[PDB]
Write a protein that binds this ligand. Structure first.
Ligand SMILES: Nc1nc2c(ncn2[C@@H]2O[C@H](COP(=O)(O)OP(=O)(O)O)[C@@H](O)[C@H]2O)c(=O)[nH]1
Ligand SMILES: [Mg+2]
Length: 361
């Protein structure tokens, strides 16, 4: 039994469209759905073709990492856009990030196909098979495409991209369905007041099934709240299973006290210090005590200081690139997370900024 005249169905896909500068990312996203929410990232919604699809353009990247990380942590499928001769620094950083995130499902879009030739495209695909070997992108399909209605072959590859997205989405739907039996958790990516109905948050159910009228909590505030209503692509629904992108009206909390990264659940860890079992990127500088890094977990990001570095329980003076260690970190703001949330560490001053991934010990 469900609300409405027809169930929503288990058909949806949250897709992140990312990549280096001038890679055709925005043009692709904009041609895949209609522009909706826009901040440092932009949602393009398309629920007119079967699945409730949301494409997130991380348009503030490469300028900021949070744009990229937020887009990836609210999506289940990544589309990495690489233009002709596009093997540059940020394309490399994107590959590293996806791999440090253990991002399972994705596709590489070899954009701007009308500006190149099949033989060059075959050569770029060959190079990529190599660059992605031994990474989570190793078996991702590479699809040549363009979004130029005036090209000799207008929009070639777009139909193929859509088809592959739907296939991958089918696998994701089954994986998310398995999470329905867990306690509910919703990551909030936006929050604002709406005249006539108050506090509204937009986010995605990460696990379990959130239900209209649930009495739960919001973290890091650790405050009781009630879910007044849940909307999916503008229609009220009685429940929202894992993977569902939602809009929710909340009772007992003001939009002004909610930030991207807050979590709705019955329980979350809230701390300002962290002890993480980490794996350091081979493509970063050795990490040392007293150094400063940037931490990302869920949809939160903040600077942190390295207080202590240990290996096999013993304290050391550095963690070299490509090593595993335990990092004791300290920050100023309270962040919310559960043990299953993967942490990312970065050094915003480097060229390739991702330094490591880790989990709370
Ligand atoms: N010829 C051609 N140009 C494209 C295509 N897609 C994007 N562009 C152009 O490439 C440049 C950057 O595109 P954009 O979508 O902004 O990429 P982004 O800035 O990384 O999001 C602009 O000139 C776009 O009009 C394409 O399909 N074919
Ligand atoms: Mg962009």
């Amino acid at each position: 039994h469900s609300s409405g005249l027809v169930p929503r169905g288990s058909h949806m896909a949250n897709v992140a469209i990312i990549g280096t500068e001038k890679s055709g990312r925005t043009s692709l996203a904009a041609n895949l759905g209609k522009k909706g929410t826009s901040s440092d990232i932009t949602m393009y919604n398309n629920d007119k073709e079967g699945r409730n699809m949301v494409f997130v353009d991380a348009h503030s990247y490469p300028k900021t990492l949070k744009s990229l990380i937020t887009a990836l942590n609210i999506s289940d499928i990544a589309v990495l856009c690489i233009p002709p001769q596009g093997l540059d620094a940020h394309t490399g950083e994107c590959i590293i990030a996806l791999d440090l995130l253990g991002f399972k499902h994705g596709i590489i879009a070899l954009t701007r196909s009308d500006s190149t030739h099949m033989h060059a495209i075959d050569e770029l695909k060959a190079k990529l098979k190599v660059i992605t070997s031994g990474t989570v992108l190793q078996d991702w399909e590479c699809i040549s495409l363009n979004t130029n209605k005036s090209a000799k072959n207008p929009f070639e590859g777009v139909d193929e991209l859509k088809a592959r997205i739907n296939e991958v989405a089918e696998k994701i739907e089954a994986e998310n369905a398995e999470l329905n039996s867990l306690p509910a958790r919703i990551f909030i990516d936006h929050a604002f007041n709406v005249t006539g109905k108050g506090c509204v948050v937009l986010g995605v159910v990460k696990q379990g099934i959130s239900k209209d009228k649930d009495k739960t909590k919001i973290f890091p505030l650790d405050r009781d709240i009630e879910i007044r209503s849940i909307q999916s692509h503008d229609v009220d629904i009685d429940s929202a299973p894992a993977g569902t992108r939602v809009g929710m009206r909340l009772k007992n909390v003001q939009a002004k006290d909610i930030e991207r990264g807050f979590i709705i659940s019955d329980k979350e860890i809230v701390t300002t210090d962290y002890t993480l079992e980490c794996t350091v990127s081979k493509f970063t500088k050795k990490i040392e005590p007293a150094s400063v890094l940037h931490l990302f977990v869920g949809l939160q990001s903040e600077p942190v200081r390295v207080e202590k570095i240990l290996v096999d329980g013993n304290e050391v003076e550095e963690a070299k690139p490509g090593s595993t260690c335990v990092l004791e970190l300290s920050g100023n703001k309270k962040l919310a997370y559960s043990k299953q949330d993967r942490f990312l560490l970065a050094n915003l001053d480097l060229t390739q900024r991702f330094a490591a991934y880790g989990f709370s010990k």
